[PDB]
Amino acid sequence: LTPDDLININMQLQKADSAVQEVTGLDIKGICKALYGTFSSSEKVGIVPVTSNFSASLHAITQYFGFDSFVTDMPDVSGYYEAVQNGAEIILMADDRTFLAHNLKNGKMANNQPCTGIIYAEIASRYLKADSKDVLVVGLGKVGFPGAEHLVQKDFRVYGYDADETLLERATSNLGIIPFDPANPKKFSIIFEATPCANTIPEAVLSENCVLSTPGIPCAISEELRDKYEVQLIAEPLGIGTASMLYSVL
Ligand SMILES: NC(=O)c1ccc[n+]([C@@H]2O[C@H](COP(=O)([O-])OP(=O)(O)OC[C@H]3O[C@@H](n4cnc5c(N)ncnc54)[C@H](O)[C@@H]3O)[C@@H](O)[C@H]2O)c1
Ligand SMILES: [Mg+2]
Ligand code: NA
């Protein structure tokens, strides 16, 4: 990582912590502890690079959350061996399809996708100044679906939309979410987006001071629409989802 990148990671996490605290009354750590019922004892976490930067970002992130983390010198299997040999209690590693946390002490394993969906949906659901239990979920994929599922389990009135009609069909029958028509816009104060696309939240769906909790990249909404409605944005590239994985595994 360049000097700029390191500054950016800490800046984004601090900014994310403030935004989450403003919205929910708790920081990311607080959200995680309440979500999972776990507490951190500064567990030793071995981050192993996989050949199928990212790991350097993970190191900065895990240190920020108080973990005793290190990155192995070797990648892949040699790295895994090195991590276990050096007393890693939790292993953190990713290929192109899967990013996992594996707690070797208790056997618990986390997948980044549902962990990210759940925490971003949790943050959204815990908006203190919410005037209803209506929540809009945009994107019902590997991150969105678990997020919507969590909101349903918390007895929220969950509206969902996905541009993939088959996935929308699946979610509407298996989860019991209300299919949302973007052409029939109702106003929401709680929005959860999990899409790799921009401009996915129509203006007409927005109300003033609404919370948009989104792990999606690029941003679901433009800066101009964000400013016009004073949207309380919760958006961070990696750390929040990583914290969710670690706490879910403790
Ligand atoms: N910030 C983080 O920590 C973090 C962690 C994991 C993933 N992500 C990001 O979250 C995003 C979603 O991840 P994923 O694994 O669920 O992807 P995915 O492909 O499994 O799901 C994305 C879904 O969004 C839907 N979609 C696309 N455009 C849409 C539109 N205009 N309206 C409604 N739905 C639309 C697609 O049909 C798809 O089902 C990705 O950008 C990913 O990189 C972020
Ligand atoms: Mg994140
Ligand atoms: Na997006």
UniProtKB/Swiss-Prot annotation:
One of its GO terms (molecular function) is oxidoreductase activity. L-pyrrolysine binds at L1, V50, A94. Pathway: Amino-acid biosynthesis; L-pyrrolysine biosynthesis. It is an enzyme of class 1 (oxidoreductase). InterPro entries: NAD(P)-bd_dom_sf, PylD_N, Pyrrolys_PylD. Pfam families: PylD_N. It catalyses: (3R)-3-methyl-D-ornithyl-N(6)-L-lysine + NAD(+) = L-pyrrolysine + NH4(+) + NADH + 2 H(+). Gene3D superfamilies: 3.40.50.12150, NAD(P)-binding Rossmann-like Domain (3.40.50.720). GO terms for biological process: amino acid biosynthetic process. Keywords: Amino-acid biosynthesis, NAD, Oxidoreductase. NAD(+) binds at K142, V143, D162, C197, P215, I217, E236. The keyword Amino-acid biosynthesis applies. Its EC number is 1.4.1.-. Catalyzes the ultimate step of the pyrrolysine biosynthesis pathway by converting the isopeptide (3R)-3-methyl-D-ornithyl-N(6)-L-lysine to the 22nd proteinogenic amino acid. Is able to use surrogate substrates such as (3R)-D-ornithyl-N(6)-L-lysine in vitro. Belongs to the PylD family. NCBIfam families: pyrrolys_PylD. This is Pyrrolysine synthase.
